[model samples]
Target chain A: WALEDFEIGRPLGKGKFGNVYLAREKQSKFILALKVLFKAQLEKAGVEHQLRREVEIQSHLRHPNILRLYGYFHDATRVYLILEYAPLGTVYRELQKLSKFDEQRTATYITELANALSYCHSKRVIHRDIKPENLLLGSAGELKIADFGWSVTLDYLPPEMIEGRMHDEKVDLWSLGVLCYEFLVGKPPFEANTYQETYKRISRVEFTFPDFVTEGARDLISRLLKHNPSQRPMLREVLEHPWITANSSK
Target chain B: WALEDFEIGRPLGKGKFGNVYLAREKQSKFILALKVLFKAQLEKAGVEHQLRREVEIQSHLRHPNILRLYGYFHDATRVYLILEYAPLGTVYRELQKLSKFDEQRTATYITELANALSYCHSKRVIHRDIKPENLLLGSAGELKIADFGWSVTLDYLPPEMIEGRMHDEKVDLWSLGVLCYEFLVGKPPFEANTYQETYKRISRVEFTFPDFVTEGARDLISRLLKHNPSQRPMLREVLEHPWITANSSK
Candidate 1:
């Protein structure tokens, strides 16, 4: 249920995890997106570590392509993420409505994302979860990443040392690849009703380019999809690819 | 002249700063890759930082997908990098001779790379130059990234607190993208005779996607090519892409 106690403004959007609302800082003049997430859901999923990571991730990251986290509030029942308001909404929503972004728009968004990722990497931070839905478009078509539940900062202890550990910056590259495909196709490449099935696909590293996928595009995606994560293209390397170089529209 | 003076087996390969050779220990019977470099060349290029970074980056990181450095040796005229030896040679060369990789083979490599990248990101390491040339295949077809002259680690402080600093883990993602394209097309995405032109194209972050590029592949590459430097996709995101999912053989 939505938090009725706090002063409300308007609805933002909803995804598999939570909902965002555009609201005002009752004590201040700034407009903010109040993210309302249920504590029970988070606890059931054993996501306290994830919350800690989200805070650490947003606290340090500041890039044109990533959504800005102002702060957060929590008590006994619910969690709140005070964040930047994306007036244009998520790129995911936009892409779903119009499968495949135009060359100019895609270029603009790609440029923004690449820059943001590079910044994050410089800080040794990785957004493990990257998707069209996780992306937001701010003023002037600037792109920003939203979710950080799965991101990490390597300045701390090793991930293997912790249970239920997800991943690092390279995992963000994987999410970006998935998001890029979804932006163009309007949905993820593999669709399974159950979360476990989706997990299986990822763990086993399954799938292929259909005949419809262009050879050049397929060429690049194939490399990103390489089962060995280290084998996948790094962010800077992707920018220099022939396909991206030739398009150079943005 | 090559390191014919030492008990060397064969020449490993050439790198931007030097050449590597496979060598064996006379007493221990251990096999290693010895990187041979000239002091004059590095001194002329003002590349002491590069040398130190490589030393620092390899000293801290240990992963399945990354190249391993056991030790380093240097003298007035030469520098040598004693590294782990992988017999499969370069991945691009293997892929090129065979055309594109099949689904199973690609997935295996991608998985290994993901694990390696995840580990590197956790350590705040960035493999800035990710290309087919950097990715070497082991005897069992395992992928390993070599060459750390351009690698960056978290916590590394540049000489100047100003601009033009090295990147962290995200650089791995950028290079991952480049390696991906090379695998698909059997060539470097950005080719130039002069380093000046290559640097110009890279700094400007221009890209081109041909009609032959599939929508899924195109979307993923576009995300990878985000030019703002802040928007580069992290390693995690690259793995989640649909094309990768659909194409991974497992």
Candidate 2:
């Protein structure tokens, strides 16, 4: 519950305003990922409210695919979040090792992510950023949606978000579509030579599947990546899609 | 936004602490189910906290199968909730007329309820009371999980809850099992001649399926109605169950 209760170990990774370290609880001997954020850096970035909202939202969520935000504490110059340690590291790293995932692996990950996002949306929490970098893998190689940061990169941003139009949880659906494409293709759907070209492509809802992609997988991706957000299928539908149902491990 | 904004019409139904009425929003001409609770009655019953928690939890949820709690306001003597109007009335009334649901109807209802309960559990909200009466049929005859009241009757109470032990959302899984049984058999699994008998049966986890129940339905019911809550399948599993997957209309 406090700094003294933990025996800080090796640094796991770094973030915009913080670094993650592996730590052990002295009393319970529970291993946890300790995320330490610099108060000064957070203030400088004017993301104090973002951090507070992220903590408030993530701490209350309880789902297997979603990373656990156990608790948090603060010191004079820093804030710390007690998180579940995903030993297998980020999906980004795994994707880097292999250019792309097979249909089975991609379907499994998509199923988990869709279920987790469904839970998040049910709680009225919009995960504005959902990408390979934000996904971790548990000891059993289960996907864990982590890092409740209030931001996103252009490659994953939906047209509504990019155009500054009113958007809701459907934004996550677009991100999920982009993620699915990336999982099977080794790059996002809207990847182009320039930022403007990518933006135009996204706005135009332009994307295609390689010959290797299954018909079912292509069908689901097409449904999710529609220009009209409302046209996108619900998370339940995503889970029930032939591709996910046939190939998902869990 | 306030009592004055609605043109209250016919009384829809009565509840433990309030009565629901059909109403129309004066400005938008939108039909709504207005739940009016007496402040003094709520205070007398010492359930102000329960109402507060229910309002806080239900208002934030946005799922098709879950009833919508648009907003609420209060006056000197009353608290009011603007809810989505499910025009087809309670599922209990429908079940009463039909004695019991056919396999298709039951599977469809179970699928919808399981998905809603899954969403609720994901948000860490336990629907301690899930029964026929708490379920409504929307305009299109879609099942809608309604009434976020923080209480349950013996017919639907899980063994853990009845034992006065520490329990969590898995309690809903047990209730779902009971509901699935009641849908197929015209009564709950543990129903008996008296309260004591029912309690004994529940504690012992005794139940039987009718000759008409299919093998798949029986298997799912058996898995869900186990004495050990942990042994019960998760909602996702319930959705994927052969009975639900093959028969569910949605």
Candidate 3:
């Protein structure tokens, strides 16, 4: 379908790159979020290639815990991507109002995210960004990976991303660890006041857990935050962890 | 990720061309159904292109009401599709044993089925088969479209299909009407003792509602089973009908 085939409802949100709107397909009456990106801005920022890669990767991945990119169409001014509407909105907005998620909820979301990541890695699509900001919740409270822009390249500066060396899919494992901490603690593990300190902490993979953090949760985070990317537990291992298994989608 | 990475378990069921097994990925211990299709059988059946189209369409659709096609890997002898393990078995077997589904349960399943069809049709992929046999139940009693073998072409001879006229995705809508009747009345809407009579009934779009059938459901079915494909109600309308919305997933 083309841009003319949809009836735009309302603005969902505005991002640095584009604005998302709630729209309904004229023929199907199917509601979707139409993300409209400015061509000139993307081209000026030298990220048009990044957007292309994002669309290419996301449209090919099929999983319950990943947002669906239904189709894309463009006019002379803007590009529109029809995406699955996440009724519950992004996890980042939810967390902004409420600090931290409960253990069971956090574990279930983490486990589901791992399933999505495992499926991605199996397809050789590296998801370098795994934070709550890029995660959306479906009506059934299922966690979905919503952003692929950062996956096109490293954004959080993991060991390999920071060291200017070769990196593999495990770069996401580092972000998953940071996400786990943020889920339970309400903040990124390596988040520091200064850019220099944040870079240093992430490069050294240093993060402390509060006493309130449960032992199993703490252990999983430690294993994932290993400084050597090779030593970090794989996505499969994370899914099979005691904490994750306890909170399975069962 | 590869065939070697999974430990195949007991057989789940047998298909005309292959057998399905319950298997687990070694690393994550994630349980899935592994469908093994013989290459020779697929080749001899003259359905290689059909099978390819089936996989292409099924793997691209990601909906809660559609079974997940996790991944595909093949060797020289057979092709394997890792699928979602629907523990409660298929809707056909369940209805066969129970005689028929209750109105509430049928309504729920119908609503979900329409949701999946709406998503698929929006993407311009028609599921040529929509029957109880192709619908499976998740552990939570959720109905998921499980098979896509017939999605590549006309399984049932719709008017447009048999006449060689260009048709869109509404063939699935016709099948949906048959499925709804079967769910409520314990038999297909146009089933006959012979294939000849069955085709005649389908071509004329003739089906009578049992006296016990509710008026709301009868209206919906009638709307979908229209003789003219263009007159048939879209999946979205079926999903939003008061009868369905009363028991909606919301």
Candidate 4:
């Protein structure tokens, strides 16, 4: 359905470009998140092409652990992207409220994330951002990798990207490690007073596990958080880890 | 990354554009049917644009009853389409072997095909060719519409298609009638001894029902195989028919 056909509802949330609202198609009554982007604002920010690319990439992917872009439409002033509505919302919100998840929950999330990432890698689309904020959780606790906005490489980016190095899929493995650490310990491994310090920590691969962190989990994080992207384990290897396999759902 | 990455197995079959091979990804050992289309042949036929369009539509669709196009890769000589392998093979082969199926079996197939076609129509994609040859059977007898190669209008086609006029999704409903009849009676409703006769029968909406066929099914067949496209029931209506609903799996 077009923008004219959807019955707009309450606001879902706001993002970099514009606001998302709950909307249902008038004819089909199909519920979706309508991300309405102001064309002028996107033009001003020079991210119009990026937005197009995000829709292009996400619209083609179909997997349980990935949110779908049902379709899109546009008028003179705005662009509307119809996205899948995850009822339980984001894992980042869930993580903050709970402080930290138990080992079982953490392992399961990692496993699901790994599977999704493997599928993405198979398609040759590397999700540059893999943090909790970009992972939406379904009501049944399924993790859906979201926000392909960062799929494009940039500055203020991963250590490898910042160094102007030609990087590949392993950049995602680093983010996955950082996200995994936060899931277990309630904070990012490289929590620092300033962005500069965080960058340095990440570039130097500086992090230590708490006493409470189990050996298996610690091993995975260390392998994934390697400073040299080449040393970071592949998503399939991460999925087959004893810790991930032990707690992962059948 | 390229065609060489897969270990080619025995030939699956030949298509209009290529030979399909049962191949496995070397690293993941994932089994997929690799359809190898010769670039020279495609260019010679001047259907390169058509091949691109077919891939464009099929890659975006994700449905159980639609054969999945995993991805594609190419070398200089050929382009390879990685597709989901249907263990039980095509519905055409199955029907030729079985001659005809029972009412319940035909109903179940129709239900699944309708759902799949409904999903396709929702995506604004019309499966212009919905004959038994285009429908494939999965291991569990799941019907998957295999080809979008005929999305373009042409030739002594459906009534709407031949009028040199615009047609919508209703053309598929016409094909659905032909499919349903073929499943139950071992021959399509418009079967004729020659191309001229077949075209005449289809254009005139001429078909006879055996007295042994159930009344409910007969009613649906007559309704679908209408001379005018508009008179034919919409796919959703067909799915909701008494005969289809009674035999459909909840």
Candidate 5:
């Protein structure tokens, strides 16, 4: 569990605080991702609590679709998080190259994310941020939810979040709706020219599907993007929706 | 946060480790259950890890039907767990008094348990023990799942567990089936005179419904009590079963 126990490889990804690196444990030869976070940067951002909370939540979670936080160690300046290495990297990178995924792929990804979020909610951990950037791909191209940093990009923000009202796990449902659209249409459903306009659209629950989006997919998205959080489908219902059941792969 | 912060009242229940007491937080006057566990007893039984794991798991879980573990503090001799007080006491007491619950009450209880178990499974938690003895009733008479002590009472144990095979959350599904039967017929489905006989019956998935049991109730119970753990209905499916939807109240 010490930094010296691992042989670091090439950098996997860079972050504001530090970077993620591919590393191999010298003794067990287990491959994993090493997330290095600078203490000074965290202190400057006043996000030490956020990082600690993320570690506490992510370390306990064990599911195929959720990224694993193996363990962590620290030195004078930085904290190192041992994580499950998602070899295929960020889904955002792949989505950028592909433009948009086909229905089957989109459905499979949606199903996996929904299941993971359901697990998170059961543990009372709200993944306030869910987007392509926060998702990685396993060796088999299975979607893996990464990152525990909570967020507020208006495109994915549910009305309740923007309205300064109390929000709950339903926020993830709304984000899932946004992610589903992004997966298929190559953009968020409620995106507008400006932040204010996007916020307005979100508040009104204004969104439309391209004709290419199937009716089943449209129905699922519509149900998730409801103005009222309670009206949004539960994660279990989302998993059971026709679009998910019919199109998602095992 | 300490023993002195609470004004202890009468004992609520007794346990092998220690006892639960009805208590009130002095500052806020909040009513809660204070669970005191003897350190020496836990160390002698080599169950310190079990107690730690139970505290770790239960403290993070938040749902209406799952008993809340507020927080804990300890002295040298004993560990204290602050918990939500379920004023009405164990469901086993009520079941004993009534013989068995009627269809509506049973269905409602079943639905609530299924929902809670669904949440637990989503979090990768297996409540190995699921019986009326571990279920309590809140002030509103709503069921609250208490005690995160994983167990093996042969009466509720799934065949996989009895067979000494690897088990998962599906074990809870089987116990739910046994519970459903117990709710209606006033006993477990596969009860036998001896432990070996009961084990044999469980291995064979040998269970029958009473003539008085409704077709829908029988169907739900049968689906859950399958010998093959994978063949058993998931908690989500259990929630959507016709018997639950038709008879369970909001």
Candidate 6:
């Protein structure tokens, strides 16, 4: 099912984790993206726990902007996650295609993504893996958060911080802020290859806003990434902030 | 009182209309920037009206942030604009001394200037030349707007249909954007030496923001330079904009 089902058939997309195959219901021809993963691969890496947590956190999310995970399955040696096929591919290369952001046009993009995150939070889904590689756009320029392999569930009592399990929805918020800044500046903030350095800086909120990130957006990002969770605004409230409301493209 | 008082010192600066000189302030034991020009020099080129307008404009403006013009004196052959000297020198070479906008320090400088501009606009003054060359930061980082040669008064409206007056405060706002861009990117926006071409593009609003401009400031500049005057936000509103609010040290 891995090679034959994906390559011999039409693949919706390819990524580091797995390639998505476009499959249809035999009865109706309704199409969807089928994420094919081999269980042996995770077992080999000793990250099976990450794979299960991904499913448990991502399945209940139902936002139109988020990729829908319809169902999951396992046979003797593989796992599968049926997802939505975004006709447009990853955002990693889109910035490279355009030389720079039109100030208004860039603001429009930031507002749109913030609005999308607000929608995602309503149903309690926090996309932990919010990087350019995970952000997909449809052909019509509609952005949708596609991969949920690292999404987290936001709830009344948040998960206790454990080593390696520390990043939460706030983590996603931080990532979104980083992504927005990167898109504007054409480079990622706080660069260090080792995860240890990256996490250390992240915990301390060690980063910077360039001359272009409006003072308001800078303030909002700072508030969002405060070390204390209670100090951070909910994504819904953040979307409605005076800063976002003032600068955003409608 | 302005004309016969002092010995001319070294050349302080140079621009299209005239050269600024270091001159002694007889009463105060201080040096000042003396902008001296010959009537024949201006009339030979026929921009006498522009020279008269600058004197008329700067004389009435009484804002602390604005470089003070201690009135001017004219003879049958020449004219002069006696001005202040921030002996601490310009922030242009100073900030460029750092090579770029260091966020914390730049935030303080930007906020200070924005507040100063807000004050200037309240009194109906427009500082047409608001570039890094015109910004002098004292040793302890006191910010002041210099070079009133392009400053305009509200009454000096369009002398001819295409006189291209800088009467409106938006001209200052546009220059502010350019100055900020310069501090970050090391060059002014839309800098073509020939006035005809530079004026054509600026009037048409045909410039593109580079990757260095943040979405926030870019939006404000786009708004400031909108071809339609009605679409331009007032100076008061601009001070409250997102990027400024977010990143302001004050």
When just chain B is superposed on the true chain B, each candidate scores a TM-score of 0.74, 0.90, 0.88, 0.90, 0.90, 0.71
- Better model by DockQ, 5 or 6? 5
Docking class of 3: incorrect
lDDT of 1 at A35: 83
**Candidate 4 residue-wise lDDT, A8-124, digit = tens:** 998978877789988899998988789989998997776888889888888888988888888888988988889888888889799889989998898888888788878877887
Tens digit per residue, CA lDDT, model 6, B1-250: 6556777889988866668888887767667778878788797676787878877877776655667787888878778888877777888677667777744465556667778777766766555445666677654567787764445311111112113342355555555555656666555555676755665555555667767667776776666655544466666676687877777667
Off by over 4 Å in 6: A1-18, A22-31, A49-53, A103-124, A149-167, A192-206, A225-229, A247-250, B1-250
TM-score value, chain A, candidate 4: 0.90
lDDT of 1 by residue, A138-233 (tens): 877787777764355111111121123323455555655665555545556655677656555555556554555556555656666555456667
Q: lDDT tens digits, residues A99-188, model 2?
A: 999989999999999888888777766766476777999999989988675322121111222233244567677777888888998878
Q: List the residue pairs that clash in candidate 2.
A: none
Candidate 3, B67-172: lDDT as tens digits: 9998898998989998999999889899989898778888888888888888876786766646576789999988998877435311111121123324446666
Q: What's the CA error at residue A220 for candidate 4, in Å?
A: 82
In the order shown, the candidates' DockQ scores are 0.01, 0.01, 0.01, 0.01, 0.01, 0.00
Q: List where candidate 1 sits over 4 angstroms from the true fold.
A: A1-7, A13-19, A26-28, A38-45, A75-78, A153-167, A191-213, A248-250, B1-250
lDDT of each: 0.64, 0.80, 0.78, 0.77, 0.81, 0.63
lDDT of 2 by residue, B120-220 (tens): 77776676646677789998888998866533212111122223323445666777778888889888777777765666677767788889999999998
Separately for all candidates shown, the number of backbone clashes (residues 3 or more apart, or on different chains) is: 99, 0, 0, 0, 0, 7
lDDT of 6: 0.63
What is candidate 2's local distance difference test score? Answer: 0.80
In the range A1-250, model 5's lDDT, one tens digit per residue, is 7899999999988889999999999999999999999999998787877788878777888999999899999999999999999999899889899999999999999999988888877777776646677799999988998876532212111122223424556667877888888899998776778765666666666778888988998999888777666777889999999889999995
Q: Which runs in model 3 stand beyond 4 Å of their true positions?
A: A150-166, B1-250
TM-scores of the candidates are 0.42, 0.47, 0.46, 0.47, 0.48, 0.41
Q: After superposition, how far is residue B153 of candidate 2 from its true place, in Å?
A: 36
DockQ of 2: 0.01
lDDT of 6 by residue, A1-250 (tens): 2323332348766755566787765555556678767777776665677889878767776655566787787778778886767776776678788845544555555666667677666755555535677777766666677665445401000012101233355655655566656676676665567755665555555778778777766776667656554556667776676776776665
The residue pairs that clash in candidate 5, if any, are none
Q: Tens digit of lDDT per residue, candidate 1, span B149-199?
A: 435410111112112333445555555555555455455455456765555
